């Protein structure tokens, strides 16, 4: 009934202990189909309550935490059997599914349906992901029958619980989506209802979402950034995540997506804040409209380019030699553009003699010229033709800055 859910919340907090949770796990298990079923039923049933949130705003983070814990436990169980699985498959439900598949046995050593199961049974698995998994298996998956049957059983139990939790979460999200046109209308208007639900659910409540700073919003719903998986897009959009898959961004060209995405994040945040501020049964949603309009305008501007330049004219060729200057100051700069004395010497070639070349492996052509003194040349080489300091390839302002930044980063890393 309606009264169950604070109890549920309390139960969820008892799991917040650490791995190994064993007696705790048993408790956890008890806590599971007790609570993770009734809730689902309630959700399914319409007109039980409209003020379930913010008690479901209280619970979703707890749920998330629980799921994370479960995932960790699973990894612990499996690591030393298959360490890289965690690395490769980050999503916890997905990981669980993979584990389940892996365990299955029967025709699994050759090919069940092995590489068939991943795509279908663990629905999430994309080709790239699958390939890497396969590679990992080939290298690091030990495929000797599980350390004990007990261990296997435990893992199965974990999977069952984790899966259930995931299902519950999904249900909650769905419920939120169904509601959110009432909950966070502005946000919905900005983005789209499902997206809003996803964001909001991730946050906690609307308040939680509002509290979240705009730059973070972007990378909500991102798939855990793997080192091995490729990233750079034509878009230039580092984040992806729920917002990036919105209509508001994805309709425009990929040129604009990064900037557009950024714009959306901030506006989304603003919308969320507005929603939080509002009392129930106000549904203003004028601000959101305005924001949307502005976003559209911005997009349009970004897509439109500069009007053609009036082709800049070649200057009336007059051949002025007005300048005539010098100065310790000025002569340095000009030194960089002067041919230096050694270069001048090089440019001089002795008449009768075969001139001193240097055999650069790239090209032998190079004439060392009469920079090396005859006698010197006959004997050997010279740093007398390494005279000047005023033309020693300095960096740009930009380049210098970049190098400094790099250095700073390195320093930070070292600390």
């Amino acid at each position: 009934p309606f009264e169950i859910l604070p109890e549920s919340i309390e139960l969820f907090r008892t799991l917040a202990l650490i791995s190994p949770d064993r007696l705790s796990l048993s408790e956890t298990a008890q806590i599971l189909p007790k609570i993770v079923d009734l809730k689902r039923i309630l959700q399914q049933q319409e007109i039980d309550f409209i003020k379930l949130l913010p008690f479901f705003n209280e619970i979703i983070p707890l749920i998330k935490s629980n799921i994370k814990l479960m995932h960790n436990f699973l990894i612990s169980l499996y690591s030393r059997r298959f360490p890289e699985l965690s690395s490769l498959i980050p999503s916890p439900l997905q990981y669980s599914k993979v584990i389940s598949i892996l365990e299955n046995e029967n025709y699994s050593k050759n090919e069940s349906d092995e590489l068939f199961f991943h795509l279908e049974n663990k629905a999430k698995l994309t080709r790239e992901q699958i390939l890497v998994l396969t590679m990992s298996m080939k290298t690091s998956f030990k495929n000797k029958e599980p350390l004990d049957i007990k261990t296997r059983t435990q893992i199965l139990e974990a999977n069952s619980i984790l899966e259930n939790l995931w299902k519950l979460q999904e249900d909650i999200g769905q419920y939120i989506a169904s509601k959110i046109s009432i909950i966070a209308p502005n946000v919905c208007f900005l983005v789209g209802p499902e997206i809003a639900a996803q964001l909001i659910a991730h946050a906690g409540g609307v308040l939680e979402f509002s509290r979240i700073p705009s730059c973070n919003i972007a990378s909500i719903g991102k798939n855990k950034h793997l080192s091995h998986e490729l990233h750079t897009l034509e878009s230039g959009v580092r984040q992806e995540g729920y917002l990036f898959a919105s209509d508001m961004i994805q309709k425009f060209p990929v040129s604009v997506h990064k900037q557009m995405l950024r714009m959306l994040c901030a506006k989304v945040s603003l919308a969320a804040r507005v929603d939080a501020g509002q009392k129930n049964g106000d549904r203003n949603t004028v601000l959101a409209h305005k924001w949307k309009a502005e976003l559209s305008k911005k997009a349009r501007k970004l897509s439109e380019a500069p009007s053609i330049s009036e082709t800049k004219a070649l200057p009336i060729p007059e051949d002025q030699p007005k300048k005539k200057r010098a100065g310790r100051k000025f002569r340095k700069y000009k030194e960089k553009f002067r041919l230096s004395h050694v270069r001048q010497l090089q440019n001089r070639m002795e008449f009768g003699k075969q001139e001193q070349t240097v055999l650069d492996s790239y090209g032998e052509e190079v004439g060392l010229g009469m920079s090396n003194t005859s006698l010197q040349q006959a004997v050997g080489a010279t740093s007398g033709s390494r005279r000047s300091a005023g033309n020693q390839a300095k960096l740009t302002k930009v380049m210098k800055h970049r190098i400094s930044e790099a250095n700073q980063q390195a320093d930070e890393f070292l600390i």
Binding site: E310, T311, A313, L314, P315, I316, P317, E318, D319
Partner: protein
């Protein structure tokens, strides 16, 4: 181009054009509207004209229409351009052996611009002739 470069109507107009630009150089393409080579030249010159607006003006002329200036080439009439500064006709020695007019298409825009610049310089000096920086010989 047809739209971009201004085209002249009758010999008087041409004469006026040649006279009036005291500051700039004047490039008159004399060519029959529908010819290939002439068209190519026009296209080239369109590009150049905008670039060199500050030192040289381009104009086009239908040579079959305006027959006043068959003094300029002795009734040979290929698809030509001609160069003027202070109403003085400007001679540009290419390889071609006709120093008076370039009667051949040059494909490089930049090259064309350079030659224009050279002739402008010559004009400024007062030199009626000028030696082009590009040899040609082949086009003719």
């Amino acid at each position: 181009a047809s739209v971009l470069l201004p085209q002249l109507r009758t010999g008087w107009h041409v004469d006026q054009a040649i006279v009036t630009e005291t500051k700039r150089l004047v490039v008159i393409r004399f060519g029959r509207k529908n010819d290939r080579q002439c068209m190519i030249m026009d296209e080239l010159l369109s590009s150049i004209a905008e670039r060199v607006r500050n030192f040289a003006v381009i104009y086009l002329c239908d040579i079959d229409e305006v027959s006043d200036f068959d003094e300029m080439y002795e009734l040979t009439d290929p698809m030509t351009v001609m160069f003027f500064y202070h109403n003085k006709h400007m001679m540009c020695d290419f390889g071609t052996g006709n120093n008076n007019k370039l009667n051949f298409i040059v494909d490089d825009k930049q090259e064309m611009i350079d030659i224009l610049e050279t002739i402008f310089r010559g004009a400024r000096k007062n030199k009626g002739l000028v030696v082009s920086p590009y040899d040609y010989n082949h086009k003719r």
